[PDB]
C-alpha cells in the first residue's frame, strides 16, 4: 500500500471496487479495465459529487452500470461503499444473493438489480434502507413469500416482474405510497386483498400472468387518480363491479385471458382519458353497446358476444353453470 486519496471516505470505495473488480468473472465491454489507480472519480460507471455532509469533500455518490453485460457476484466488501444512493446494475449477468453487508448503505435511494441472475429468497436487507424510493427486482429468480413489511415503507415504485413468488399478496398493500407496482409474470396465489383503495396515490399497476383467483374486490374504485390497471392472463372469476366508475383518471385497462363472467357496464367505459380497453378472451354475457365505435380502442375477441364476431363456440361459452360466482359469501369479495 503506497497510495493516498483526497479523503478517507473514497479510500474505502477503492477497497470495495477493487475487491468487487476481483469478483468480475466476465466483462465483454471491457468497462472494468479502467478500474485501476486512486483517481476513482474517473472510473467508468462510478460518479462523484460534493458530499451532502460537507461540500468541501467529494465522495462517490452513485454507481451506474447500465446494460454492459457484466458477470460475477456482489462480495460483502461493498459495505465500505457508503453514501451511494443510485445503484444501476441492470441487464448484466450478475449472480449470488444480495450481501447482508449492503445494509450499511443507509443513503440508498434507488436500487436497480433488474435483469440479473440473482437467485435468493426476498432480499430482507433491501428493507433496512430508509431512503429507498425506487426498487426493481424484475427478471430475477427470487423465491418464496413477499414480506408484508415492504409496503409499510414509504416507497414510490416496486417492480417484481418475471420472478418466482409463491405466496399471496399481503394485506399491507394498502399502506404503500408506491406510485407504481408490478406483479407481472409471477406465481402469486390467493385473492387480491380488499385494502387497495387505501392508496390514494397509486398511478400504475399490473397483474399480467399470475395464478391469482377470486372475485374482484370492489374496493378498487377508490383509486380516483389511477392510470394503468391490468389483470391479464389471470384466473379471476366473477362479474365486473359497478363501483369501478370512480376510476375517473384511468387511461388503459386490460382484463384478457381471464374467466370473468357477468355484465359489462356502459357507465365508466366512456371516459375521455381511457384508451385501449381490452377485455378479449373472456366470458361476458353482458353487452358492449357503448363500451367498438372508433374514437378509442376496444377488443372483444373470444368474449361470447352473439352480436359481435370472433366469438366462442356456444358449447364452449357457459357449458358449465351459467351462474357466475355469487361474489357474496366469498372470502375475497365480502361476507
Amino acid at each position: 500500500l503506497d497510495l493516498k486519496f483526497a479523503n478517507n471516505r473514497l479510500k474505502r470505495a477503492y477497497i470495495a471496487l477493487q475487491a468487487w473488480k476481483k469478483a468480475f468473472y466476465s466483462d465483454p465491454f471491457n468497462t472494468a479495465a479502467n478500474w485501476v489507480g486512486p483517481d476513482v472519480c474517473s472510473y467508468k460507471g462510478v460518479f462523484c459529487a460534493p458530499a451532502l455532509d460537507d461540500p468541501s469533500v467529494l465522495v462517490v455518490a452513485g454507481i451506474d452500470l447500465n446494460h454492459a453485460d457484466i458477470a460475477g457476484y456482489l462480495p460483502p466488501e461493498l459495505g465500505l461503499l457508503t453514501d451511494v444512493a443510485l445503484f444501476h446494475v441492470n441487464s448484466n449477468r450478475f449472480c449470488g444473493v444480495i450481501p447482508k453487508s449492503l445494509s450499511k448503505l443507509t443513503l440508498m435511494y434507488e436500487f436497480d438489480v433488474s435483469n440479473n441472475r440473482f437467485v435468493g429468497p426476498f432480499p430482507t436487507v433491501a428493507l433496512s434502507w430508509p431512503s429507498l424510493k425506487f426498487l426493481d427486482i424484475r427478471y430475477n429468480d427470487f423465491e418464496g413469500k413477499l414480506p408484508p413489511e415492504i409496503f409499510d415503507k414509504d416507497l414510490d415504485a416496486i417492480f417484481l416482474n418475471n420472478n418466482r413468488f409463491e405466496s399471496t399478496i399481503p394485506e399491507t398493500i394498502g399502506k404503500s405510497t408506491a406510485s407504481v407496482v408490478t406483479f407481472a409474470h409471477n406465481k402469486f396465489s390467493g385473492c387480491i386483498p380488499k385494502t387497495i383503495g387505501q392508496m390514494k396515490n397509486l398511478n400504475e399497476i399490473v397483474f399480467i400472468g399470475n395464478n391469482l383467483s377470486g372475485c374482484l374486490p370492489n374496493e378498487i374504485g377508490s383509486l380516483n387518480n389511477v392510470t394503468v390497471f391490468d389483470a391479464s392472463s389471470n384466473g379471476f372469476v366473477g362479474s365486473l363491479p359497478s363501483t369501478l366508475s370512480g376510476l375517473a383518471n384511468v387511461e388503459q385497462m386490460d382484463f384478457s385471458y381471464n374467466k370473468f363472467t357477468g355484465f359489462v357496464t356502459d357507465n365508466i367505459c366512456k371516459l375521455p382519458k381511457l384508451s385501449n380497453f381490452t377485455f378479449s378472451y373472456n366470458f361476458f354475457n353482458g353487452e358492449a353497446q357503448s363500451c367498438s365505435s372508433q374514437e378509442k380502442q376496444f377488443d372483444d375477441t373470444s368474449n361470447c358476444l352473439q352480436n359481435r364476431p370472433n366469438q366462442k363456440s356456444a358449447k364452449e361459452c357457459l357449458p358449465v353453470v351459467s351462474r357466475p360466482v355469487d361474489c357474496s359469501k366469498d372470502k375475497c369479495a365480502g361476507g
Partner: protein
C-alpha cells in the same frame, strides 16, 4: 404515450438513457449530480 408499468416487462429498457443521472432527474447533465432529484413521482418524469 409513455407508460413505465408496461415498459417494465422489457428487461432491457431503462427509465433514463443518459447514464449516471438519477432516474428521477433524467434531464441535461450540466453537472451530472447523482444527488439531485427533479421529479417526485415516476410517472410524470419518464425521460
Amino acid at each position: 404515450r409513455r407508460y413505465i408499468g408496461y415498459d417494465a416487462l422489457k428487461k432491457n429498457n431503462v427509465p433514463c438513457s443518459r447514464r449516471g443521472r438519477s432516474y428521477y432527474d433524467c434531464k441535461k447533465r450540466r453537472r451530472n449530480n447523482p444527488y439531485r432529484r427533479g421529479c417526485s413521482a415516476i410517472t410524470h418524469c419518464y425521460r
